[PDB]
């Protein structure tokens, strides 16, 4: 397949073709077309940089799938793992947890910071 | 504010060094300017801000502060320098001025 | 900046005198931001030197809006103005006295923030003589 | 034994230059606020404990940058406006007619010739011009700017009102706000708090007094550079506003005539009703109280023994010796002599005559001159007098009385009051520090 | 806390709130406002990238705090650890070591490159 | 040395001083100069970001030298290792690989992704 | 001339063509265009056959 | 002898400050900058 090929597929199928669609995240005078193109280019760069920084803060920079250390509170979604990994599509799963998204980001950031501080303390000795 | 400038006059040889000073009654930072006037000629600027050199003049001229005591030093006097010297601060001007001449 | 003054003037006591100081091609300053010429913020000071006496500061004019400031001793009898079209500055002294005779200089001040009251360019000087 | 470690996102900042962008809260305005990024309803505001930072209102670059900005917007709003060159024609003017003794000869009924929509014909058109806009060569007059600079008419749909704009630094930069209520011009500010970006700043255009703007918190403050310096100005900031009502009690109908294909020019039609004189009112008791507070706060830098006298300006152009400002798309120059007459020593209102101008050349530009279009109907505006631009007068050492006069002209001094409590800084999120760890 | 909250605090608090003040490092015609905004955005992106590249050179990308392999020469500072981390603010430390920054940066760069080369040579077995 | 110092040198010298040129990969009105400079800066950032994309997809973010786990297919270049690393400068090497880059690039990313997936499946236990 | 009493008539340059050359609209990086491949798609609503571009 | 007709003293009727009256104004032009139609040149 190619870009966005398996969007409607299952978590199981989509979770193995991250690279094929992650690769395509980045791809004159002062006329209207020129200024529009320049603005679009810089906006795409800014969006990608925001996402990359968000990856980096949780200690997952340069990793397509990284594991974390924050527990999954069942209040977000109590559904069984197999159910959500064998039937749904990614769009439905994202729609389900849309409102529970800032909280998990904050928990992840605090967990990574605490883990990093602990790692430094251990590496002191 | 009042400015007192000294000496009223002085005399010197060729090539020697001299100093002319003035005290201002307040604290003015380094906002002192130095002016020289040849006889019958319009005065021209030499030292501005009490430690910078105006363009187009010799580097033998110097000026400095010590507390509120501002002074101008002359090295290697060349007798074109005969004339008058004044220090200005802000709006006030030093009365009289200091006249320098050869021996 | 080259500064051209007026000529020698002789006036009777009780009259009025006027001294013109021209500074060609120096009133306007480029503003590279907007890329246009704006009237500068420079100052024109007026000093006098009595025969055998130190210089005395009369007053100065910021030529941006023509603002002025005179020495309080001469207050009420000296007016200072500028004409931006011909790039000149006019001093108008009223009701001169016998001691008013002197050499009057016009001086240019860059009005930079760091250096205060720096008068770089000086006019050739004018001889204002009053007698009966 | 020690080793070095790098820390990202370390709280270090250094004062630095930086371009800032406008941001307002949601009509074409002369300040292009429609291009400003909308601001968040609740700006973030973070206090900083145990933080002492130096400030310098006079070395601040924010005022210079924002002055350059305001100039740019002012010119840009004029570029797509009607050219007014064909107005420089001989004007047959007569005196104008139910007029009080004050406005005798200050309004001119001028008829002249104009190029119509076509070109083979010309039309005779009459209009009203203020005396300050015409000069003699019925009598033949001409516009004040005909032998110098060109005239461009401001499009009569741009609101000249100052809509507040917040200046905001981009990411990686911060703004520091001095919360110290007793903060003079420069020096350390123990109560300093960071902010996302500036508060509501009104680009009010004025020369002698400060209109609207922002007030103080504790009491009236006197901020300046060296108060010893007669040349340097004196910013004042009040603790309570002085309510000033300025109005032009003429109906002042507007007549739209055609001078070119598509381009149209708006002239002053015949005034309906009595022709009075535009004037301003300030509460006498409030003004006296404000002046007393000002002199009490001002005696600190001069001594109780010293005498303080307020006098009207010593001279200059019409836009400095008088109180010049803009109200409702019109320009006013108020005599303001009655506002400075005290001789402070150890219900009634103060009417101020004002004059109206239409050929405006603010921020003197060699070649340009705005023509302010007439405004229909009587015009009135209530404003807050908040600060004064005073200037000292150099005196003899023996003399013990200081004379203060209104000044201005340099709009940087006007604009520094609204940005005196802000500093633009650059965040340096990279640090190094010694720890005992050793990387594997 | 918040952005720059620990600025006046000592080392102890500041060295644990890195993420909160690192989260906000990144957040249409040719009008004066528009061009100013575009230049500001590009400047912010450029600054962030410069810092991130400097981090990546020292082999600490994706980490808030990392340990290195060069020792602290007492020539840079003779102050002991305890008062350094419990007595002075970050700004004071930065002003104290500002004029020594280039050479230590070079030391980290060289050491990281050497360590990477040695690790590659060892991995060659 | 300096920027591009070992450009003509052999493999060994260049492979020891990468960081001298890695660190030099990143270093107003609407006039001609303004738009020209803005386009230049945006283009430089975009090029460096595409480079960072290609590095990150290979799981070597922040590393000047990283190793992979794919065989060197002799169909690309079946030449003796010693002569490659003691004879040909980087330029000539590029001129002899330039036809074969895309495929190997893809291989890299695929392997990396697969590796990551496998690693995750290992860490779930 | 008709518009001379209200407008500011300007002449189009002679060599510039008015013929509509086909153009393509492209979204920047990080964005996609979803095209409804379905041939029975009325005004609004779901399109069961979506293709990206 | 090298300026025989090179410099032309040309006068015209450029408008004055106000755009209603014409004023006779003279100037000098280089022969390569004028074309004939004293005589008339443009
Ligand atoms: C300090 O701030 C105060 C508070 O804003 C400010 O007072 C305002 O002044 C403006 C200036 O005229 C007033 O605006 C007018 O309001 C009346 C009543 O609503 C309107 O009828 C007027 O309409 C005219 O202007 C329109 C502009 O598009 C035209 O379209 C229309 O046809 C009319 O010609 C005009 O908007 C305003 O009412 C007050 N008050 C408030 C609350 O805004 C004061 O001016 C400031 N001080 C300054 C600027 O020095
Ligand atoms: C553009 O035109 C105006 C008006 O004609 C010019 O202003 C006028 O300039 C003359 C110059 O001589 C001034 O005359 C002077 O008046 C004073 C009294 O104030 C008198 O003492 C002098 O001897 C002299 O006669 C006149 O006052 C002045 N009027 C105004 C209203 O400004 C202006 O200079 C012209 N600009 C140009 C030609 O660039
Ligand atoms: C300035 O002067 C002009 C010139 O008169 C005034 O404009 C209007 O001019 C017309 C023709 O010249 C006047 O029309 C005549 O009015 C008289 C008296 O109303 C009437 O008897 C005639 O039959 C003819 O209609 C017109 O009156 C005049 N406008 C007004 C209001 O009278 C212009 O008004 C003058 N500006 C002023 C007075 O502010
Ligand atoms: C520019 O010129 C055009 C062309 O004349 C003007 O449009 C015309 O405007 C007049 C008056 O506004 C209209 O006259 C009216 O016509 C109706 C019939 O439709 C009649 O019943 C009324 O008694 C009145 O006479 C005329 O219709 C109109 N023509 C068109 C084609 O719209 C226009 O107003 C001018 N613009 C200016 C002067 O700014
Ligand atoms: C008077 O004005 C001068 C203007 O320079 C001030 O002098 C500067 O003061 C700052 C302190 O903020 C110093 O860093 C500068 O080196 C000074 N420069 C010069 C040329 O003096 C001065 O502080 C002001 N006040 C007084 C009392 O003089
Ligand atoms: C504004 O307040 C600051 C804080 O006190 C003043 O800074 C000191 O002021 C005292 C008294 O004037 C001086 O003795 C010190 O030398 C000042 N500090 C420095 C570093 O020079 C500052 O002077 C005040 N500004 C004005 C205009 O009064
Ligand atoms: C100013 O002039 C306007 C325009 O004439 C006046 O507004 C008119 O007032 C009369 C009665 O006074 C009404 O019959 C009209 O309908 C109004 N509008 C027009 C367009 O004529 C206004 O009254 C005058 N005085 C003010 C504004 O104080
Ligand atoms: C400013 O104050 C003056 C005087 O207090 C006001 O003038 C009076 O206004 C009223 C109402 O308009 C008239 O009835 C009077 O005839 C006016 N003159 C006098 C001497 O009372 C003026 O209206 C005030 N203007 C503003 C805007 O407040
Ligand atoms: C300026 O205008 C304001 C508002 O119209 C006037 O304030 C009014 O004053 C009267 C008499 O003092 C009071 O009865 C009203 O309640 C006030 N209204 C408001 C809204 O404040 C004020 O008097 C005018 N003149 C001055 C000098 O401020
Ligand atoms: C400031 O106030 C003084 C008060 O005397 C004004 O001086 C008088 O102004 C009138 C105006 O025509 C002159 O006729 C007098 O000759 C002036 N008197 C003197 C002694 O010169 C002065 O004009 C005011 N300044 C302003 C309003 O800017
Ligand atoms: C500004 O206002 C003052 C005072 O209202 C004016 O000074 C008056 O000038 C006239 C004419 O010269 C004298 O008869 C008065 O005696 C003056 N009054 C005072 C208090 O001195 C001054 O002329 C005005 N200036 C302008 C430019 O309008
Ligand atoms: C003039 O000053 C008054 C002072 O009270 C301003 O009124 C205050 O405005 C602030 C901010 O808009 C509010 O938070 C206060 O609640 C207001 N207080 C009162 C008593 O009104 C007024 O906004 C200022 N500007 C004007 C009148 O245009
Ligand atoms: C350019 O080529 C020459 C020779 O091909 C290189 O010289 C080598 O230098 C190293 C460093 O001392 C020696 O160990 C080798 O023995 C030299 N080569 C030979 C054949 O003796 C040189 O280093 C190359 N690069 C530069 C920048 O000159
Ligand atoms: C779509 O649904 C079918 C139904 O089983 C499934 O086989 C397929 O993997 C799904 N995804 C794609 C991309 O076809
Ligand atoms: C203010 O009021 C006091 C009360 O007597 C008076 O002495 C003083 O002159 C007044 N100041 C003015 C009107 O400026
Ligand atoms: C400010 O300093 C005091 C010193 O006693 C300290 O206790 C306090 O925590 C500091 N403030 C902050 C916000 O850390």
CSV table of C-alpha atoms in Angstrom, one decimal, chain D residues 128-276:
chain,number,residue,atom,x,y,z
D,128,UNK,CA,-15.6,75.5,3.3
D,129,UNK,CA,-12.0,75.5,4.4
D,130,UNK,CA,-10.5,76.3,7.7
D,131,UNK,CA,-8.1,79.3,7.7
D,132,UNK,CA,-5.2,77.1,8.8
D,133,UNK,CA,-5.4,75.1,5.5
D,134,UNK,CA,-5.3,78.0,3.0
D,135,UNK,CA,-2.8,80.8,2.3
D,136,UNK,CA,-3.2,83.9,0.2
D,137,UNK,CA,-1.1,84.1,-3.0
D,138,UNK,CA,-12.9,88.1,-3.0
D,139,UNK,CA,-9.3,87.0,-2.8
D,140,UNK,CA,-7.2,84.2,-4.4
D,141,UNK,CA,-6.0,81.5,-1.9
D,142,UNK,CA,-4.4,78.1,-2.3
D,143,UNK,CA,-4.1,75.0,-0.2
D,144,UNK,CA,-1.3,75.2,2.5
D,145,UNK,CA,0.5,72.2,0.9
D,146,UNK,CA,0.7,73.0,-2.8
D,147,UNK,CA,4.3,74.2,-3.1
D,148,UNK,CA,5.5,71.4,-0.8
D,149,UNK,CA,4.5,67.7,-0.6
D,150,UNK,CA,1.4,66.1,-2.2
D,151,UNK,CA,-2.0,65.6,-0.7
D,152,UNK,CA,-3.7,62.2,-0.4
D,153,UNK,CA,-7.3,62.0,1.0
D,154,UNK,CA,-7.9,59.4,3.7
D,155,UNK,CA,-10.6,57.1,2.6
D,156,UNK,CA,-13.7,58.2,4.7
D,157,UNK,CA,-14.3,54.7,6.0
D,158,UNK,CA,-11.2,54.0,8.1
D,159,UNK,CA,-11.9,54.5,11.8
D,160,UNK,CA,-9.2,56.7,13.2
D,161,UNK,CA,-10.2,55.6,16.7
D,162,UNK,CA,-7.3,53.8,18.6
D,163,UNK,CA,-8.4,50.2,18.9
D,164,UNK,CA,-6.3,48.5,21.6
D,165,UNK,CA,-3.6,46.2,20.3
D,166,UNK,CA,-1.5,43.7,22.3
D,167,UNK,CA,2.1,43.3,21.1
D,168,UNK,CA,3.2,39.7,21.4
D,169,UNK,CA,6.6,38.1,21.0
D,170,UNK,CA,6.9,34.8,19.1
D,171,UNK,CA,7.7,31.5,20.7
D,172,UNK,CA,11.0,31.2,22.5
D,173,UNK,CA,10.7,34.8,23.7
D,174,UNK,CA,9.0,36.3,26.8
D,175,UNK,CA,7.7,39.6,28.0
D,176,UNK,CA,8.5,40.7,31.6
D,177,UNK,CA,6.0,43.1,33.3
D,178,UNK,CA,7.1,45.3,36.2
D,179,UNK,CA,4.4,44.9,38.8
D,180,UNK,CA,6.2,47.3,41.2
D,181,UNK,CA,3.6,50.1,41.6
D,182,UNK,CA,6.3,52.6,42.7
D,183,UNK,CA,8.6,51.9,39.7
D,184,UNK,CA,10.3,54.9,38.2
D,185,UNK,CA,11.9,54.9,34.8
D,186,UNK,CA,14.9,52.6,35.1
D,187,UNK,CA,16.5,50.3,37.6
D,188,UNK,CA,15.7,47.0,39.3
D,189,UNK,CA,12.1,45.9,39.6
D,190,UNK,CA,11.6,43.4,42.5
D,191,UNK,CA,8.0,42.7,41.5
D,192,UNK,CA,8.4,41.4,38.0
D,193,UNK,CA,6.1,38.8,36.4
D,194,UNK,CA,6.3,37.2,33.0
D,195,UNK,CA,3.4,37.3,30.6
D,196,UNK,CA,2.5,35.7,27.3
D,197,UNK,CA,2.3,39.2,25.7
D,198,UNK,CA,1.3,42.8,26.4
D,199,UNK,CA,-1.9,44.1,27.8
D,200,UNK,CA,-4.3,46.4,26.0
D,201,UNK,CA,-2.2,49.2,24.4
D,202,UNK,CA,-4.1,52.0,22.8
D,203,UNK,CA,-2.0,53.8,20.1
D,204,UNK,CA,-3.6,57.1,21.1
D,205,UNK,CA,-2.2,60.0,19.0
D,206,UNK,CA,-1.6,63.1,21.0
D,207,UNK,CA,1.2,65.7,21.6
D,208,UNK,CA,0.8,67.8,24.8
D,209,UNK,CA,-1.3,65.5,27.1
D,210,UNK,CA,-1.8,61.8,27.2
D,211,UNK,CA,-5.3,60.7,26.4
D,212,UNK,CA,-7.0,57.5,27.6
D,213,UNK,CA,-4.1,55.1,27.9
D,214,UNK,CA,-3.3,53.4,31.2
D,215,UNK,CA,-3.3,54.9,34.7
D,216,UNK,CA,-1.0,54.3,37.7
D,217,UNK,CA,-2.0,52.2,40.7
D,218,UNK,CA,-0.8,53.8,43.9
D,219,UNK,CA,-0.3,57.5,43.1
D,220,UNK,CA,0.8,59.9,40.4
D,221,UNK,CA,4.3,59.2,39.3
D,222,UNK,CA,7.0,61.3,37.5
D,223,UNK,CA,9.2,59.2,35.2
D,224,UNK,CA,12.0,60.6,33.1
D,225,UNK,CA,15.6,60.3,32.1
D,226,UNK,CA,18.0,62.6,34.0
D,227,UNK,CA,15.7,65.1,35.7
D,228,UNK,CA,18.7,67.3,35.7
D,229,UNK,CA,18.5,67.4,31.9
D,230,UNK,CA,16.3,70.3,30.7
D,231,UNK,CA,16.3,68.7,27.2
D,232,UNK,CA,15.0,65.4,28.3
D,233,UNK,CA,11.2,65.3,28.7
D,234,UNK,CA,9.2,64.4,31.8
D,235,UNK,CA,6.5,61.8,31.6
D,236,UNK,CA,3.7,62.0,34.2
D,237,UNK,CA,1.2,59.3,35.1
D,238,UNK,CA,-1.9,60.1,37.1
D,239,UNK,CA,-3.7,58.0,39.7
D,240,UNK,CA,-7.2,59.2,38.6
D,241,UNK,CA,-8.3,60.3,35.2
D,242,UNK,CA,-9.2,63.8,34.3
D,243,UNK,CA,-12.4,63.7,32.3
D,244,UNK,CA,-12.1,66.0,29.3
D,245,UNK,CA,-15.0,66.6,26.9
D,246,UNK,CA,-14.0,67.9,23.5
D,247,UNK,CA,-16.6,68.8,20.9
D,248,UNK,CA,-17.1,70.8,17.7
D,249,UNK,CA,-20.6,72.4,17.9
D,250,UNK,CA,-21.1,72.7,14.2
D,251,UNK,CA,-23.4,70.5,12.2
D,252,UNK,CA,-20.9,70.4,9.4
D,253,UNK,CA,-22.6,68.7,6.5
D,254,UNK,CA,-20.5,66.8,4.0
D,255,UNK,CA,-20.8,67.1,0.2
D,256,UNK,CA,-19.4,64.4,-2.0
D,257,UNK,CA,-18.2,65.8,-5.3
D,258,UNK,CA,-16.5,64.0,-8.2
D,259,UNK,CA,-13.0,65.0,-9.3
D,260,UNK,CA,-12.0,62.0,-11.4
D,261,UNK,CA,-13.1,58.7,-13.0
D,262,UNK,CA,-14.3,56.7,-10.0
D,263,UNK,CA,-12.2,58.8,-7.5
D,264,UNK,CA,-14.4,61.1,-5.5
D,265,UNK,CA,-13.5,63.9,-3.1
D,266,UNK,CA,-15.5,64.9,0.0
D,267,UNK,CA,-15.7,68.6,0.7
D,268,UNK,CA,-17.3,70.7,3.5
D,269,UNK,CA,-20.8,71.7,2.7
D,270,UNK,CA,-22.6,74.7,4.0
D,271,UNK,CA,-22.9,74.5,7.8
D,272,UNK,CA,-26.4,74.3,9.0
D,273,UNK,CA,-27.1,76.3,12.2
D,274,UNK,CA,-24.9,78.7,14.2
D,275,UNK,CA,-21.2,78.5,13.7
D,276,UNK,CA,-19.6,78.2,17.2
